[PDB]
């Protein structure tokens, strides 16, 4: 069809079989880089806006405010532009020029915060802006907004179901907000009724899901796997649908993403390397020899040109 605006064009991302990972083609990847603003977050950018419209929290002339300049910030920026909303994004002044320019190109009102305060400063500035005129501004809150996992339940999950003819046995997904693994798992287990294995992936450097489920001290840590490992259990992570948690280290995530490019011709981001490293480990267990493993690849390589990936 013809999409009325770019937000409606989200999803329908392809599945590609891996040749150099898994065993006898049991690993398949879903390429979320193929989206209106080139990441998985495009889906949630669209649906959080759409849900806010439907429930009347977002109306003509209201302005979107947030403190993300990662994938969600970019997603919200294209959606705001596509649907005629003003948007302010707060970010620490030490963020890259490439990111400032991208966000400015998408028509965002960028508010740079104190380098010394990091993300906390940007989040406070955003919260402050909203507090100043609550009726003018709306903050969509990706970590708790149910419209996040809902879009994955309505689109991402059903796409996996349909493109595999229901043969999917395992879903492997890195956890940032938890929305992807939550929505996809609820779709396949509840709407389609199939008892798959849902595998959350997190950094070995910040393995808070692992620690939580073991009843151990929760000790977040720094890592390089952008987009995952938030260091807390987000509200949009439904632990009741998680079967297994795999930890992956930053270096192996990076090396794996490099292999995806050089050996498969897949321009994957860092967290995609992490998800595949986790999937490859399960795929080489005799228990998953005859199991179809589907892995979410959240983003695309060129967004990482200035990073350790290259």
């Amino acid at each position: 069809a013809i999409y009325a605006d770019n937000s409606y064009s989200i999803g329908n991302t392809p599945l590609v079989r891996l040749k150099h990972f898994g065993h006898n083609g049991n690993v398949v990847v879903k390429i979320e880089g193929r989206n209106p603003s080139y990441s998985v977050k495009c889906r949630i950018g669209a649906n959080m806006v759409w849900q806010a419209e439907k429930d009347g929290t977002l109306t003509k002339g209201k302005e979107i405010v947030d403190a993300t300049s990662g994938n969600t910030g970019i997603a919200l920026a294209y959606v705001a532009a596509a649907r005629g909303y003003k948007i302010t994004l707060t970010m620490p002044e030490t963020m890259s020029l490439e990111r400032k320019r991208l966000l400015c190109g998408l028509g965002v009102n960028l508010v740079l915060t104190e380098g010394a305060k990091g993300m906390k400063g940007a989040i406070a500035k955003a919260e402050e802006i909203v507090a100043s005129d609550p009726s003018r501004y709306v903050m969509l809150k990706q970590f708790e907004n149910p419209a996040n996992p809902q879009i994955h339940r309505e689109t991402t999950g059903p796409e996996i179901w349909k493109d595999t003819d229901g043969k999917v046995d395992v879903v492997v997904a890195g956890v940032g907000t938890g929305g992807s693994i939550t929505g996809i798992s609820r779709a396949i287990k509840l709407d389609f009724g199939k008892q798959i294995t849902s595998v959350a992936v997190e950094p070995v450097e910040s393995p808070v899901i692992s620690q939580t489920l073991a009843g151990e001290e929760v000790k977040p840590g720094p890592h390089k796997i952008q987009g995952i490992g938030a260091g807390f259990i987000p509200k949009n992570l439904d632990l009741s649908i998680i079967d297994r948690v795999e930890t992956v280290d930053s270096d192996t995530a990076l090396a794996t993403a490099r292999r995806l490019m050089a050996e498969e011709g897949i321009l994957a981001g860092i967290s995609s390397g992490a998800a595949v490293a986790a999937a490859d480990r399960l795929a080489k267990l005799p228990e998953f020899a005859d199991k179809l493993i589907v892995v979410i690849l959240p983003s695309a390589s060129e967004r990482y040109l200035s990073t350790a990936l290259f």
Binding site: T68, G70, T72, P222, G227, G229, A230, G231
Partner: peptide, 4 residues
């Protein structure tokens, strides 16, 4: 790490 919260910049997602």
């Amino acid at each position: 790490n919260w910049n997602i």
